[PDB]
Amino acid sequence: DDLFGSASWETEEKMIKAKLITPNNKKRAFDKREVIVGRRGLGDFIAYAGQAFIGLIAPTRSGKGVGFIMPNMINYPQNIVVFDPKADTMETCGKIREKRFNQKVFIYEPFSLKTHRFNPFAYVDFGDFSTQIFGLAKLVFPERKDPFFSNQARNLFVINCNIYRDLMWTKKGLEFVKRKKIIMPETPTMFFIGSMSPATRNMWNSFKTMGGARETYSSVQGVYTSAFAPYNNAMIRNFTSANDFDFRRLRIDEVSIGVIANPKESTIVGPILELFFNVMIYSNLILPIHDPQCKRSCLMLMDEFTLCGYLETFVKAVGIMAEYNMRPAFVFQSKAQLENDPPLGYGRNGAKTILDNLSLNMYYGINNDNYYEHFEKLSKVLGKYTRQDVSRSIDDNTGKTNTSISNKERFLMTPDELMTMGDELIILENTLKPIKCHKALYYDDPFFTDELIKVSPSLSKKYKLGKVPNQATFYDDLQAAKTRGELSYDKSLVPVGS
Amino acid sequence: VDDLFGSASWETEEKMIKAKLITPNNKKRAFDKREVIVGRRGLGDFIAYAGQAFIGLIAPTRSGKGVGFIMPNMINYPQNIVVFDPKADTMETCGKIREKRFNQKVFIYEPFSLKTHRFNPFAYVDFGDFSTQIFGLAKLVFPERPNEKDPFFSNQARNLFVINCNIYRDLMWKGLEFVKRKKPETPTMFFIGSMASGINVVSLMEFFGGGDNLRVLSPATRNMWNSFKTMYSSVQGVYTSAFAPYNNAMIRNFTSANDFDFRRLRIDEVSIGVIANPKESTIVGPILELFFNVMIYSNLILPIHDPQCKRSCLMLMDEFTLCGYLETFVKAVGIMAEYNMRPAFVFQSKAQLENDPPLGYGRNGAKTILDNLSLNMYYGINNDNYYEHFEKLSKVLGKYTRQDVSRSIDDNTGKTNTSISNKERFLMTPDELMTMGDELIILENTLKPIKCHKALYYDDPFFTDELIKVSPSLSKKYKLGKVPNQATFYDDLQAAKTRGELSYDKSLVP
Amino acid sequence: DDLFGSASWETEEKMIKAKLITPNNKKRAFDKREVIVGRRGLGDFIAYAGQAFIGLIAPTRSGKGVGFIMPNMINYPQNIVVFDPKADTMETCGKIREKRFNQKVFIYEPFSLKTHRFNPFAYVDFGDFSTQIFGLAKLVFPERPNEKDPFFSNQARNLFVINCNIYRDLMWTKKGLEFVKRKKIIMPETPTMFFIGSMASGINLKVVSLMEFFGGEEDKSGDNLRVLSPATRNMWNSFKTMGGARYSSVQGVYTSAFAPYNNAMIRNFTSANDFDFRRLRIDEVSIGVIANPKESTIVGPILELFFNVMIYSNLILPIHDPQCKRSCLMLMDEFTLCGYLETFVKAVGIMAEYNMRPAFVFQSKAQLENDPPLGYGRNGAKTILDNLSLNMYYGINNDNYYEHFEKLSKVLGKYTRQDVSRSIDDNTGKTNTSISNKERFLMTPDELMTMGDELIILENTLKPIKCHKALYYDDPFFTDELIKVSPSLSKKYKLGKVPNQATFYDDLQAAKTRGELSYDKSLVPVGSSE
């Protein structure tokens, strides 16, 4: 009966048809670039294939790292770009990325000398020219009681880059600079642009265009400098000092990219991460049919996504990124933090645009009164099924009994039941009925601890491969081995600046 | 038939027949009312919207908007179509169908490719209507500024465009006397982008004009410049920034000439595909704005005023939110219906439509567009972010009366008792709508809710028959009239698209 | 029993007592200026008498024209002021208004040269004056809730009034005419808004500034200041102490307040005043306003004046003047399209006893509650809605309107129904029947959304009414008047019979394109810019 609802968990057959599991799931090949989202037991995983996007609504300290980030870091066989704010994911899985999958590891730490460098001017064709320049200016000066001037500063950056362009990629400009009057580089950086032929005739007309420098140079220059100020920092200047990896090969070479950043601790790094992700996403709108070399997939483990702030590039790109095998999995504390106003959010409709492009959503549960509303909604989303309710009557004189059966409604999962799942989680796929499963714990499964023990001598002496490690001492020995860099990526290839 | 708990019910067959969505013999329906397929009740048993009202399809991702709505009407619609094809699959799959089935000329506008087509907004002027055209394009190129650094510049740049167009009509018409002064006549965008430096760079207040050319150029042709000399560098900068996208060879080739007369969009049997991804290339925004402006406004004449414009044209606005800010549709959907310009908008959610005007249409613009959709299709997906959307939909379907049975046993003996009662039940609960799968809900403004199946094209031989009889690679493997094998039809169709044998006439496009 | 509710539909009794219907309703005389709002059958109408105001909450494409506007356009025997943004209502009922009611038809299309003109300065007695001038100034220069810098708008309004006093003391004085003739001052007779705005640059001779012509370097002898009145001179001194020191920002906002009048169409529409709005309740006239403020914000303020002067020119009791016995039904069709018109918010509560009877037609209560830019604000929307005593509600099956109908469902209330349950011994076959009482919505939300061509009428002093739309195209009560007017409709369709429903609307559009159902356009003045 369905009078009081028809809610139900998804069947094993439909999950097989959706390719989430296989008939012999414990012996599955993992040959469809699948992302592990849950487990039915040790080595019996639920994994998402295809190109659809994953959302993980994980409260603070709910186990997103040990149940999603670390398992896929250890298992996923294609390219990975992971957000690593605590500098622990890469420190734990880099040796696996390099030894098991044979992938070069690039670490982008803008607030440290030891980092790989990214320069956006390495992605322009100095010699659709000015399109990249205008997009870069839009990134440098964001669109927003004080209009104009900022647009004049964007024009200042426009003909700034145009001036440096004319200064090098011209045959006479080479001699003009060979007069030894300026010290411009061979390839420009953002700091250098900030410190600074009929198209150049129009550029001179722009040098006398709206008169932005006539009795109004002070304010325009002040806004320009307030925008270019992040590059007065030595760490940021070193981060933009060069470009070590070409993002146009993110789907060609076998690479793993970690980003160690924190814009909440310092609002300065915001625009640099914005530029970084914009160039990374916009360097791969080439279909594998048009470029047969771009065959690999790039899983983007956007851990601590809401900590990144407003990245409008994602809002504009999520709806078209899927077919290019740029597959992000967003992990945010809660939806409420996502919809917030631009400064620390994406707006209501922008967050809705991002969330509409997620086809698999994992829901962890914690018993916190601050997450009630959310979980309540989740309860209502799972719907109700029909249940039998038994009542009894007894004649107090004779003692005979009467049993009555009626139908009632029951939530598939009540709010407090959702809040007290512990290590269980709910999976909602767009085309499937709700699923309940266990977190793919990495430290509990030999499926991942074997890979962790393989590449480390200490764990190899302590624990045997294939056996579940002694839970009372495994994590501590893993930490002790991480202190000596046994699990970390080889840090000798990470460049160091002055 | 009890309405004690509401009277919610699906629309009856009789009322659907009266609404021309189906016929008394729907399997043998002739499709003679220019109907748009919006779902099926079975193999070849389709529900089809007649009339002139507009369709809206709220189809999320991984929902089958193309395979359930775009592809079937592409195979089936007998009149003219204008499809938005950003992924290059719809046209590359149905072009040979539009060509061979309905004898229609396929015209593909892919600005970012050599094999493209050409659109010149200048071929739409009365070479009393030339001044009207000048004012029209001046309004279409200079929009109203609610908050600018100054509205005076906006109005003055509109007036500068108008006066420059008047002077250009003056010089290009005794137009041959000045031709013999120096060493094309059909204007293009970035050659009009040079219409601010000079004849080639003469001064913007001298040259051979105003001197004393108030009478050399017919009254107002050189008179407005005498009055607008107060009420050049920044003006040239703004004009060059406006015309700069034309400097790209792609857009340059797009606006180099014109191979189609949009005033004949309802005359000749044609099919217009548009390949564009403004989310990737953000520069095509204003360009597509002018494109659709001239495509729609050049068709705003009633068929009673010109019966030669007899054909209808369905605008399959697939990925409508992708187009960006197309204020044409915001200002036009309220009057287009009576002109046989019939759009069907396809979008992922209401929120994506309500996005801010730069990347969406705004709340008020989204409401203005949604208010002109009389038939609304609802595909279901099990996504928490859509709960509020489907719950309301559930509430819109209503409640009906159902029977509730309670049994009671006398344990000492075993004799039983059955008791029935009436209870309320939502016609469809929110979580039931969320898990419809291949089903969908149609809401027509003047009808009761309709539930049906998605009109899939690979499922039904109603469409695979055409796709097979058209391409030679599929005719050998599969036969007509029979539903082909589901395990190998899609891959064979992919492979047929690889060879282009199921595409269209690529040789024609410039 | 009323334990679970007592909601019910109004009986034929109370409707008769409310004068909404009569005993011989089919043969009703229509002698109490009634507005048709519904029907219980072909030619069996529900019609509102009295002076109360009507509201029609009709979603888009829900039949407000065919069910309300066009029926009363055909039937209403008194004066009609209709809003016709699509120019279709007039095009369909003009010759009915003219031939059946002998009413002169005026057309106000501020974007077609074929239009009648309106000039607010024609409603001012120059040679009382201060009150009307200040009212017109507050109309052109309205208050702002921003309050961050209202002094500039105040001084711009002071400049407007001052310019008006200067014009009055120059063109309606005795020595001012001699002064203008001696110094060759370009100044027209009856003033227009365009000229009052152009006076910001200065007095036309070229043109020199006001600060120069009066008390400046151009007025060396000081004679040009003496020609003005002492009150105007004191106001000019006060303004020179106000804006004239440290004016540059006042002239900008002043010239911006007259920017719509740099347009040629608005210039022609303002140049004259064809119809006297003080005659709206004496002569038999029918006025059609063809504008669209959403298509162009320029006509926004113009309409604001146009309607305002129309209302306040008709605030006279019939005991003051016995010529004002004619009522004026104001078919405010597509009301929110007119944007924010303060005159309606301020005047809905006072224009009822003047026989200015508006019927507001809007798509939803939420769109009317929109903020001043595109609506009236919550408080203003409530103010307008509080003065509507008969509200018609159309239904459509559209989720965007669900919250509107749920509430309406709740407004209709619940009633008590009987519910039967059955039991049965599964062995002996003996059964049991039980009856209880339950509650039932008079109309569930989905029932209202699927009402089709039925509607709900809520009158302030009655119980809910459910009736059928007063469709004109299927009722000989209206098609008789529409076929009596067109020769070919008379050649095809017979009077007193329901026309062929498959072809009547199409043949009607055909006859309309030939202008047979339209007003005589020969009497509409035509201008030209030169």
Numbering used by the authors:
A (entry chain B): 181 to 307, 335 to 351, 355 to 406, 444 to 745
B (entry chain C): 180 to 306, 334 to 379, 382 to 391, 395 to 411, 422 to 431, 437 to 457, 464 to 742
C (entry chain D): 181 to 307, 335 to 412, 421 to 461, 464 to 747
Which text from the study accompanies this structure?
CagZ, a unique protein in H. pylori, regulates Cagβ-mediated CagA transport, but the underlying mechanisms remain unclear. Our structural and biochemical data together show that Cagβ functions as a dynamic hexameric assembly.
Molecular replacement using this model found all six protomers in the asymmetric unit of the crystal, which together form a pseudo-6-fold symmetric hexameric assembly. The protomer of Cagβ shows a 3-layered overall architecture similar to TrwB. Residues 631–658, an extended segment between two α-helices in the NBD, form two long anti-parallel β-strands that stray away from the NBD and constitute the bottom layer of the 3-layered Cagβ. The six subunits in the Cagβ hexamer are not related by a perfect 6-fold symmetry. Strong density is present near the Walker A and B motifs in the structure, which was assigned to a sulfate group from the crystallization buffer, mimicking the binding of ATP to the nucleotide-binding site.
